[PDB]
């Protein structure tokens, strides 16, 4: 897949991802906050089409991600991120995608996700998150 | 269980824990670094005894933890951490415990585990990690 790395920001205002109910996570894009202005991350696109888009618009700053969870597993023989769930102090968005394979989870007791990086081919191959206070 | 929280230090010198292949992780004590000197953490003990102790002595400061993983499963009615593995830049420690149940892991690209908190009853109920640059 093609690597992306948004870098680190002040916060997260919105996430725009797409997914398929028989496969995995596909497109991924973030509108960060940067010192009070929305910072429109690049849309990281799957190499294929056919996904369902979802917009997760957060009520920033009072609303923020408290846990990112999901599943990783085989699709067409690639290990990929087959689903994601975003839980904030105000509600839960997801699961998007297919809840099958090995679960993973990052709950946060203190701090914020301030960036994503990872890799998208046909599907989201892997991702990491930047954390800050 | 009894909740514990060591708070945050400079780094980690040694991990003392204990486990039982019949059951799960039992006790947990960390020797931290505090500004280039050893600070002996509180020893968090199971309500019961019988475990095999393990000392993970790291070659601090050059060796540090890059990933912690484990399995959680039901032991005699308690949902507990049954297994832990500590992966450093130098080597892998574990698995200690029983490698059966739902997996978890925290891999770290940048940053240090600088403390632990959690709860221990008969076994290690759950734990969290302070992270710092």
């Amino acid at each position: 897949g093609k690597a992306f790395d948004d870098g680190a920001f002040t916060g997260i205002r919105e996430i725009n991802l797409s997914y398929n109910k028989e496969t995995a996570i596909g497109d991924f894009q973030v509108v960060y906050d940067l010192n009070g202005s929305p910072y429109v991350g690049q849309n990281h696109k799957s190499f294929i089409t056919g996904f369902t888009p979802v917009k997760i618009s957060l009520d920033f700053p009072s609303e923020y991600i408290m846990e990112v969870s999901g599943y990783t597993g085989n699709v067409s023989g690639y290990v990929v991120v087959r689903s994601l769930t975003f839980k904030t102090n105000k509600k839960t968005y997801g699961p998007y995608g297919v809840t099958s394979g090995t679960p993973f989870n990052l709950p946060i007791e203190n701090g914020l996700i301030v960036g994503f990086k990872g890799s998208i081919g046909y599907w989201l191959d892997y991702f990491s998150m930047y954390l800050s206070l | 269980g009894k909740a514990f929280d060591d708070g945050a230090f400079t780094g980690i010198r040694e991990i003392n824990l204990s486990y039982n292949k019949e059951t799960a992780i039992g006790d947990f004590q960390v020797v931290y670094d505090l500004n280039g000197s050893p600070y002996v953490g509180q020893n968090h003990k199971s309500f019961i005894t019988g475990f095999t102790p393990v000392k993970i002595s790291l070659d601090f400061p050059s060796e540090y933890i890059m990933e912690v993983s484990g399995y959680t499963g039901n032991v005699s009615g308690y949902v507990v951490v049954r297994s832990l593995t500590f992966k450093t830049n130098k080597k892998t420690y574990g698995p200690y415990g029983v490698t059966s149940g739902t997996p978890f892991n925290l891999p770290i690209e940048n940053g240090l585990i600088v403390g632990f908190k959690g709860s221990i009853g008969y076994w290690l109920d759950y734990f969290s990690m302070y992270l710092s640059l």
């Binding site: 990929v80 191959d125 892997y126 991702f127 990491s128 930047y130 | 891999p107 770290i108 640059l133």
Partner: peptide, 16 residues
């Protein structure tokens, strides 16, 4: 140091 600021990063999850 360099003049580049640093951030804690956790992950990756997915393909190794």
């Amino acid at each position: 140091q360099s003049g580049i600021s640093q951030t804690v990063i956790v992950g990756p999850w997915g393909a190794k």
